[PDB]
A paper describes a structure:
Carbohydrate-binding modules (CBMs) are non-catalytic proteins found appended to carbohydrate-active enzymes. Soil and marine bacteria secrete such enzymes to scavenge nutrition, and they often use CBMs to improve reaction rates and retention of released sugars. Here we present a structural and functional analysis of the recently established CBM family 92. All proteins analysed bind preferentially to β−1,6-glucans.
To probe the mode of binding of CBM92 domains, we successfully determined the protein structures of the C. pinensis proteins CpCBM92A and CpCBM92B by macromolecular crystallography. As was predicted by sequence analysis, both proteins form a β-trefoil structure comprised of 12 β-strands arranged into 3 subdomains (α, β, and γ), similar to β-trefoil domains found in Fascin and CBM13 proteins. The binding cleft Arg residue in the β-subdomain of CpCBM92B is found in subdomains β and γ in both CpCBM92A and -B, but is substituted with a Ser in the binding clefts of subdomain α in both proteins. This substitution in the α site leads to a substantial increase in accessibility around the glucosyl unit’s O2, which may permit binding to oligo- or polysaccharide extensions from this position. We also see that the α site knockout shows only a small loss of binding ability compared to the wild type, but that there is some residual binding in the β/γ site variant W523A/W565A, suggesting that the wild type α site does make some small contribution to binding in the full protein. The α binding site of CpCBM92A differs from the other two in that it lacks an otherwise well-conserved adjacent Arg that likely supports binding by interacting with a glucose ligand and by creating a topographic ‘wall’ for the binding site. To probe the respective functions of the three putative glycan binding sites, a series of modified constructs were generated for CpCBM92A, systematically altering the Trp in each WExF motif. Variants with single (W481A α site, W523A β site, W565A γ site variants), double (W481A/W565A, W481/W523A, W523A/W565A), and triple (W481A/W523A/W565A) binding site substitutions were produced using site-directed mutagenesis (red stars in Fig. 3 show the positions of the residues modified). Pull-down assays revealed that the single mutation variants showed the same binding specificities as the wild-type, while the double and triple variants showed impaired or abolished binding, confirming that there are no further unrecognised binding sites in the protein. The loss of the Trp residue from either the β or γ binding site (W523A and W565A variants, respectively) caused a major shift in apparent binding ability, with the loss of the β site having the most profound effect. This indicates that for CpCBM92A, the β site likely has the strongest affinity for the ligand.
Numbering used by the authors: 450 to 573
């Protein structure tokens, strides 16, 4: 299934076509804002961006990216949802992807999920 991800700032997660760090900075979802939800095994998922690569948590040591050709330790996430159907994505470190409210590159550094880590989504 293929989705967009709308952050707390009402902008959309952007793969940046694998060129550097991801940002939640797009006004509307188009090609670079679409991610295919792939089964990563053991009930986890990976997110494949427009460039065919996978989103990586980068161990929470730097901003997340969409440049890996394989699911190799930092690319598997738990899909966790709020009551109204927003999604939070928990990485290998147990930490959540954050939109950072769009004023910084997206990270996977936070151990709890609030607004900045909650994303609206639908299936395309």
């Amino acid at each position: 299934k293929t989705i967009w991800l709308q952050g707390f700032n009402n902008k959309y997660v952007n793969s940046k076509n694998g060129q550097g760090a991801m940002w939640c900075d797009s006004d509307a979802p188009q090609a670079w804002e679409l991610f295919t939800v792939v089964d990563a095994g053991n009930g986890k998922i990976a997110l494949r961006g427009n460039n065919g690569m996978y989103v990586s948590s980068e161990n929470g040591e730097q901003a997340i990216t969409c440049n890996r050709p394989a699911i190799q330790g930092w690319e598997a996430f738990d899909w966790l949802e709020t009551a109204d159907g927003k999604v939070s994505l928990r990485g290998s470190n147990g930490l959540f992807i954050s939109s950072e409210n769009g004023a910084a590159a997206m990270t996977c550094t936070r151990p709890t999920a609030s607004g900045w880590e909650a994303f609206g989504y639908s299936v395309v």
